[PDB]
Design a binder for this molecule. Structure first.
Ligand SMILES: Cc1cc2oc(=O)cc(CP(=O)(O)O)c2cc1C
Ligand SMILES: Cc1cc2oc(=O)cc(CP(=O)(O)O)c2cc1C
Length: 270
């Protein structure tokens, strides 16, 4: 409770300047200390579900040897706006592992939908999240409909706390077997879409893996990350935003600033 109180007022001022709501949960995996701000409210996942999607693929690969190297062929009708990798392999197909890397590191929408199909759709990803003990996460729709970010709509949402707890289980805990855990971490470390979010708050000498989400409406965007500061245990954190009006713009700078405050509250000099 103490650390959450240290940064309560700065968080309130930051979201007031932003003009919306900011939700943050950050966990120091060494001491167990946490920082919360609106950490139990639901926020739209936007593309951030794609990280958990890749983890679910990795979990299935523990039971289905050769899943990762399976080729997937698809037609032009599988392409979705913002499919930067999968459009370049339309005429050849891609493997499940390549689709997973594209979904994580480029937020590729066609790749995400193809992998959702393999796992049984939104309910199948939700079922995987239930299997690791996450009772908050829900995915309901596909790309791009899941980005609607309608105020008060619980579809395609989770909470910053549940996102962080599930991220910890998959990247540092025992939810995945050791080889799959490191592959998930490696995919997150190679993300290309988050340079202006949590990574902007993290010194250059720290390792970081993250997954972004941007809904394109309602000031709604997010990022979650595992951060390895030098000389101490890793930090896991999630920063989610939303705003009341459809035309409100998200802010990457606000996400970076919220990450800075969370790390400061935890006592992580950065
Ligand atoms: C995609 C997926 C969905 C799942 O939904 C479940 O209800 C239970 C599990 C764990 P399992 O029973 O297979 O050990 C589960 C796993 C994956 C990858
Ligand atoms: C609708 C939409 C807007 C986006 O605007 C961005 O600025 C960044 C991305 C990639 P994301 O941050 O979601 O990983 C993005 C994705 C979608 C579907």
């Amino acid at each position: 409770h103490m650390l959450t109180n240290l940064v309560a007022e700065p968080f309130a001022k930051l979201e007031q300047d932003f003009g919306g709501s900011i939700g943050v949960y950050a966990m120091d995996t060494g001491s167990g200390a946490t920082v919360s701000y609106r950490a139990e409210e639901r926020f739209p996942l936007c593309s951030s579900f794609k990280g958990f999607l890749a983890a679910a693929v990795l979990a299935r690969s523990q039971q289905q040897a050769g899943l990762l190297d399976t080729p997937i062929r698809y037609g032009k009708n599988a392409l979705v706006p913002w499919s930067p990798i999968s459009e370049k392999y339309l005429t050849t197909g891609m493997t499940v592992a390549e689709l997973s890397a594209a979904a994580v590191q480029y937020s590729d929408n066609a790749a995400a939908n193809l992998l959702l199909k393999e796992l049984g759709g939104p309910a199948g990803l939700t079922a995987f999240m239930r299997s690791i003990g996450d009772t908050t996460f829900r995915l309901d729709r596909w790309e791009l409909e899941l980005n609607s970010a309608i105020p008060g709509d619980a579809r395609d949402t989770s909470s910053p706390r549940a996102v962080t707890e599930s991220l910890q289980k998959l990247t540092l805990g025992s939810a995945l077997a050791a080889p799959q855990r490191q592959q998930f971490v490696d995919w997150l470390k190679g993300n290309t879409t988050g340079n202006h979010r949590i990574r902007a708050a993290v010194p250059a000498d720290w390792a970081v893996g993250d997954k972004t989400g941007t809904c394109g409406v309602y000031g709604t965007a997010n990022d979650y990350a595992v951060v390895w500061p030098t000389g101490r245990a890793p930090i896991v954190l999630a920063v989610y935003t939303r705003a009341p009006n459809k035309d409100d713009k998200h802010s990457e700078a606000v996400i970076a600033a919220a990450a800075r405050l969370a790390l400061e509250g935890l006592g992580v000099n950065g």
